[PDB]
Design an enzyme around this catalytic site. Structure first.
Site, PDB file in Angstrom:
ATOM      1  N   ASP A  46      -6.435   8.167  -0.645  1.00 45.36           N
ATOM      2  CA  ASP A  46      -5.890   7.146   0.307  1.00 45.36           C
ATOM      3  C   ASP A  46      -4.776   7.776   1.122  1.00 45.36           C
ATOM      4  O   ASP A  46      -3.895   8.428   0.535  1.00 45.36           O
ATOM      5  CB  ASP A  46      -5.363   5.923  -0.425  1.00 45.36           C
ATOM      6  CG  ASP A  46      -6.410   5.162  -1.189  1.00 45.36           C
ATOM      7  OD1 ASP A  46      -7.610   5.285  -0.891  1.00 45.36           O
ATOM      8  OD2 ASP A  46      -6.008   4.144  -1.834  1.00 45.36           O
ATOM      9  N   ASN A  60      -7.536   9.078  -5.919  1.00 44.24           N
ATOM     10  CA  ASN A  60      -8.305   8.046  -6.649  1.00 44.24           C
ATOM     11  C   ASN A  60      -9.135   8.706  -7.738  1.00 44.24           C
ATOM     12  O   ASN A  60      -9.468   9.885  -7.681  1.00 44.24           O
ATOM     13  CB  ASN A  60      -9.185   7.265  -5.695  1.00 44.24           C
ATOM     14  CG  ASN A  60      -8.331   6.643  -4.593  1.00 44.24           C
ATOM     15  OD1 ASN A  60      -8.643   6.788  -3.417  1.00 44.24           O
ATOM     16  ND2 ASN A  60      -7.242   6.004  -4.974  1.00 44.24           N
ATOM     17  N   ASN A  89      -9.006   5.203   2.952  1.00 40.82           N
ATOM     18  CA  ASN A  89      -9.707   6.025   1.952  1.00 40.82           C
ATOM     19  C   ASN A  89     -10.735   6.995   2.566  1.00 40.82           C
ATOM     20  O   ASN A  89     -11.543   6.623   3.430  1.00 40.82           O
ATOM     21  CB  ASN A  89     -10.347   5.069   0.963  1.00 40.82           C
ATOM     22  CG  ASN A  89     -11.023   5.747  -0.197  1.00 40.82           C
ATOM     23  OD1 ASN A  89     -12.200   6.102  -0.063  1.00 40.82           O
ATOM     24  ND2 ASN A  89     -10.307   5.950  -1.286  1.00 40.82           N
ATOM     25  N   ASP A 116     -12.211   8.457  -8.345  1.00 39.22           N
ATOM     26  CA  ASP A 116     -13.509   8.950  -7.822  1.00 39.22           C
ATOM     27  C   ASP A 116     -13.312  10.272  -7.087  1.00 39.22           C
ATOM     28  O   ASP A 116     -14.338  10.837  -6.667  1.00 39.22           O
ATOM     29  CB  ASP A 116     -14.232   7.876  -6.996  1.00 39.22           C
ATOM     30  CG  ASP A 116     -13.575   7.566  -5.655  1.00 39.22           C
ATOM     31  OD1 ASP A 116     -12.489   8.162  -5.366  1.00 39.22           O
ATOM     32  OD2 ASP A 116     -14.164   6.798  -4.855  1.00 39.22           O
ATOM     33  N   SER A 153     -11.696  10.675  -4.200  1.00 45.03           N
ATOM     34  CA  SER A 153     -11.248  10.318  -2.842  1.00 45.03           C
ATOM     35  C   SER A 153      -9.708  10.235  -2.841  1.00 45.03           C
ATOM     36  O   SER A 153      -9.103  10.238  -3.890  1.00 45.03           O
ATOM     37  CB  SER A 153     -11.886   9.064  -2.339  1.00 45.03           C
ATOM     38  OG  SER A 153     -11.401   7.961  -3.070  1.00 45.03           O
ATOM     39  N   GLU A 157       0.863  -1.216   0.000  1.00 41.91           N
ATOM     40  CA  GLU A 157       0.000   0.000   0.000  1.00 41.91           C
ATOM     41  C   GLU A 157       0.875   1.233   0.000  1.00 41.91           C
ATOM     42  O   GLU A 157       0.608   2.210  -0.715  1.00 41.91           O
ATOM     43  CB  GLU A 157      -0.974  -0.055   1.157  1.00 41.91           C
ATOM     44  CG  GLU A 157      -2.085  -1.076   1.013  1.00 41.91           C
ATOM     45  CD  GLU A 157      -3.146  -0.804  -0.047  1.00 41.91           C
ATOM     46  OE1 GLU A 157      -2.984   0.247  -0.718  1.00 41.91           O
ATOM     47  OE2 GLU A 157      -4.019  -1.748  -0.269  1.00 41.91           O
ATOM     48  N   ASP A 173     -15.625  -4.721   8.827  1.00 38.46           N
ATOM     49  CA  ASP A 173     -16.773  -4.152   8.065  1.00 38.46           C
ATOM     50  C   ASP A 173     -17.499  -5.214   7.236  1.00 38.46           C
ATOM     51  O   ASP A 173     -18.627  -4.917   6.796  1.00 38.46           O
ATOM     52  CB  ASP A 173     -16.311  -3.020   7.148  1.00 38.46           C
ATOM     53  CG  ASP A 173     -17.434  -2.237   6.507  1.00 38.46           C
ATOM     54  OD1 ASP A 173     -18.254  -1.692   7.258  1.00 38.46           O
ATOM     55  OD2 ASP A 173     -17.495  -2.227   5.257  1.00 38.46           O
TER      56      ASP A 173
END
Length: 129
Positions: free
Chosen positions: A52, A46, A59, A48, A50, A35, A101
């Site tokens: 990280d 990202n 995120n 979209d 967003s 990562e 989650d």
């Protein structure tokens, strides 16, 4: 801060990630390697919109507030900047919520594509733990 491999393994173990939700420590070290390259200051925007953040690339759409991800949530109740600290506490607390989650460590795309099904124990080999 750029962690050493064993330095990060030790810090993750002390913060309770070894076998958290059944994921041995090597899973978490491998995830951090691919990562962030063990860099707490890593950021990546990202497609979209967003971003990280930090050693586990957490995120902003769901997990942290960065003020620039419209319609997002902040389920870890933290500014995304907290995830860039030399102190991995915030990253670890948030990662425990993420991995609980429903999809486990499949939430981390670099874990699923580069660590899952590999000899992840190799990431903690040679470390004083």
């Amino acid at each position: 801060k750029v962690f050493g491999r064993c330095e990060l393994a030790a810090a993750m173990k002390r913060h309770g990630l070894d076998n958290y939700r059944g994921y041995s420590l090597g899973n978490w070290v491998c995830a951090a390697k691919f990562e962030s390259n063990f860099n707490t200051q890593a950021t990546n925007r990202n497609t979209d919109g967003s971003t990280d953040y930090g050693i586990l690339q957490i995120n902003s759409r769901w997990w942290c507030n960065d003020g620039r991800t419209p319609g997002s949530r902040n389920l870890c109740n933290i500014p995304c900047s907290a995830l860039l600290s030399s102190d991995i506490t915030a990253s670890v607390n948030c990662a425990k919520k993420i991995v609980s989650d429903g999809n486990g460590m499949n939430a981390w795309v670099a874990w699923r594509n580069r660590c899952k099904g590999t000899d992840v124990q190799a990431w903690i080999r040679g470390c004083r733990l």
